Symmetry: C3
């Protein structure tokens, strides 16, 4: 039973794939935590003027921009090129988008996606693949379908290299030399998924098909929950970003001040993949037997699964502990066990007293000694 | 293949957990019938002035009140305490509800639930847990997350949710002394107190002598039935057409009562597994699978459960003044196909199609359709 | 891992069951391709004046009429007989429909279905069963629940639904004599009469010279196509945008016809598995997986099936005057991604993104985009 987990560990990637233009790191999808969550996690690093070459995946994805700035393009079936430049055209393509640190990008199942770092700073993008989504009609192995290149799977060759050249020549009405490049015959195998682009790239961009697929949930955004002496929380859901209703995925960004806490809580209807972005915090996770299945530090760059209904609480050990939690539900609901208007505060006082064998005045203290809802300032 | 079932048996609970204030009985969730259905079944008995302590579950539930009366509270995230009494307050909590015999209660996934017996009569509550629901993102092992106490799981085949946290954390978060936190964690309790506890003086809560949406509906004898024949019996189903919460749970329930020697025509559920739990009396049931084989022919008596898999045909004859049952179904809009009777599936075929299919005379096909005028319930003789 | 397929094969039925009035052929549902797709496929042939006897299935189906004409009836629960004939009636039943070559018929889960060949030509019907549909709450073994006959399941890996019930029960419920119940149960019937039976005198049913919602649509040559090039071919898909019942089944179908030496560009299904069934002629198909490996390169000829897994790329070239096919898809709204062609996924990328990705000259990227002006179908040479 994949989720009878008695002990959890802060996880690092167990595989690194270097390409000429960057790095892709994958967490082992067969690790017990990721099989319980039913997802896969990867982290891509794009050096300046490097291009993540186009690929599509047989499952929905959420991509969080941990660092950097650049451009991405999602290329949809049944959509015309709405970006046009004269001279029959000098250039033509579907809408492209800027991304920045703190953006969540929703990639629907099967949609082609590419990404370009146009700046001097490396882009770091953490992507969550929901391999157990009911939109994945294959199997639980994460797959990438690359339209270009000649490299292996992240967890080889591109989609065109399996077709006959004479077929592609007739269908495209192009000579053999173009089809050989299309198929990536002459490509060094080490060029990889992220490639260098010497001169940089000129695309059409200013100094339904066009629906919004990204939203910033980082520090620059307006938070859902904020206490200037404890921290902040901001979730992107299908109430903010309608595409997520199709992906059945959401994400929560949070930042916790040193020695600040958020109360014990659990996700009613989702597994969470907690990925630390900055600093460290001591996390405590409790299962149905009331046993600690994790008590320890989660530090920047590592992932930790919080199974559905498992209770969790945290205390920051840094100036700012901040994280992104990917959740397997477009409308993940949080149940707070303690605090103002918490699940305990919603019970009649004499129900609390009898349940815990407490004095009436002790039940009231349990409810009302701390006035805070979710974030608790230090001490 | 979990549902290639050749033989079914009337099932009783195989485990009993006695607690201070009552009893909890569980059916084996690994039994072939319950794995085919993809559910778990339990029965809780609350003595007078006893409290089922708050817990949440990682799957949707339906609770049928077989017997008794009392109060229940569901505690939702993101909802304020709408019950308020002065003296900041003397008491404050979310809406509480009275329950009575015949009530179905819908408990959404992950929602905290507690129950209190307010009367001199024991409450008996039968709860169905849909462990194979898509809302259960864990596994098929039914789990209870208890907010209080220091006891084992109902389905261990322990401690409360707070006992896994460090005390210094809870003290800081709550701003309370160590003695309150030790009680919170259930340090003050023998493992035998259990899930249902006594409350000596009774209980005083705020109650008259979206967050507040209705989550229960009575489908018992006191309610108005959907189908009724005064010489055969009655049926009343609660669906998402009656109780919109059930649209989220993907669960429904059917209550039925059958007069002595009255029958149900053979019928099947198009789109659901049924967990048949007898409430009163007994009946002879016949269930047949796709091979045309009888996979069950025998008595179902009060207190026992029987799974009717999707599309399996079933028929019944009451052997008591009143045979009554509740059928939990794994679909908020479970549809029944009647194989025989007025406007049944056979009556919906052209007569000459019926004749050719069964190699019957024209007049024999008409008798098959129209000798009995009743739809679903058939009076004796 | 069910879909880690290193080679695909054009598949033929591996079992045939002859009956009095026709033939039923089944593809092995345990073949690795069908396990990856999560479906079962069968082909039924009805001789003139033959009747496919009523049955219901625990999963949604799409039926394509490869050949012939006749009548079908779907018999729904909770629906009255809207066809009536006087003289207290001479005949009465639920709505019946004519079907013809090119029709897709949607049979919802659990609904009774029968079919009758009314003509001098054999009817050939290819039916797809989505056993991995979440509406199938049993297991992935395809099941038929037959209301008549005394034969075995078509998928042997018997008796009708009434033969599992006790005779005395059916007599009481129906108020009919013992002779009629024995016919109902098929005790007298030879086991080889089977699922499709002859009807000697032909058949008279009520038909002209919600319950009545539309459940079939013609997607064949006689219909108006979605995509058409008079020197390449045509495509016509039925989705829930055309036939709302498919919204419930989560199934769709694509009909296509490809002229000799014409091609359709490499493409993939974003959100569905496809069961490609050739109807006429031959074509050379290429299917490549995520490693860029050819998992199929060969001919698909009329009468055979080929699974195209979700996201696997596929391309085709016709070797006949007309290659035509029907592709069943496990999504009511299957979306196609065209990798090459006008407004294809490559044409939707900036030219310098194409150039850098494939290390092409700027002018080579433009040729990749714009040398061929066609979207999906490519004429010869």
């Amino acid at each position: 039973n994949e989720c009878q987990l008695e002990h959890l560990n802060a996880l690092e990637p167990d595989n690194r794939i270097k390409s000429e233009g960057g790095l892709i790191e994958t967490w082992n999808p067969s690790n017990k935590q990721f099989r319980c969550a039913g997802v896969a996690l990867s982290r891509a690093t794009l050096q300046p003027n490097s291009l993540r070459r186009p690929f599509y995946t047989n499952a929905p994805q959420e991509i969080f921009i941990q660092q950097g700035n650049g451009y991405f393009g999602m290329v949809f079936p049944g959509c015309v090129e709405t970006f046009e430049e004269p001279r029959k055209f000098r250039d033509s393509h579907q809408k492209v988008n800027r991304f920045r640190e703190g953006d969540i990008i929703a990639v629907p199942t099967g949609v082609v996606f590419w990404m370009f770092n146009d700046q001097d700073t490396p882009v770091i993008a953490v992507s969550l693949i929901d391999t157990s989504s009911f939109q994945n009609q294959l199997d639980q192995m994460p797959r990438r379908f690359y339209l270009a290149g000649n490299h292996e799977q992240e967890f080889g060759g591109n989609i065109f290299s399996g077709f006959k050249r004479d077929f592609l020549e007739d269908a495209l009405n192009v000579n053999r030399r173009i089809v050989n490049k299309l198929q990536g015959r002459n490509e060094d195998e080490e060029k990889g998924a992220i490639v260098k682009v010497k001169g940089g790239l000129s695309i059409i961009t200013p100094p339904i098909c066009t629906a919004r697929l990204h939203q910033n949930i980082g520090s620059s955004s307006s938070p859902d929950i904020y206490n200037p002496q404890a921290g902040r929380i901001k979730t992107v859901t299908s109430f903010d970003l309608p595409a997520l209703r199709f992906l059945k995925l959401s994400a929560e960004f949070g930042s916790l001040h040193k020695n600040a806490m958020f109360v014990p809580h659990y996700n009613l209807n989702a597994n969470s993949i907690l990925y630390a972005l900055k600093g460290r915090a001591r996390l405590q996770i409790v299962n149905c037997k009331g046993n600690s299945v994790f008590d320890g530090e989660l530090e920047a760059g590592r992932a930790l699964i919080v199974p559905q209904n498992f209770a969790i609480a945290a205390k920051s050990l840094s100036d700012r502990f901040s994280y992104v939690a990917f959740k397997t539900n477009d409308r993940a609901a949080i149940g707070r066990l303690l605090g103002a208007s918490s699940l305990i505060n919603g019970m009649p006082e004499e129900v609390v007293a009898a349940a815990f064998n407490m004095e009436r005045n002790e039940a009231r203290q349990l409810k009302f000694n701390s006035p805070f809802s979710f974030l608790v300032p230090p001490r």
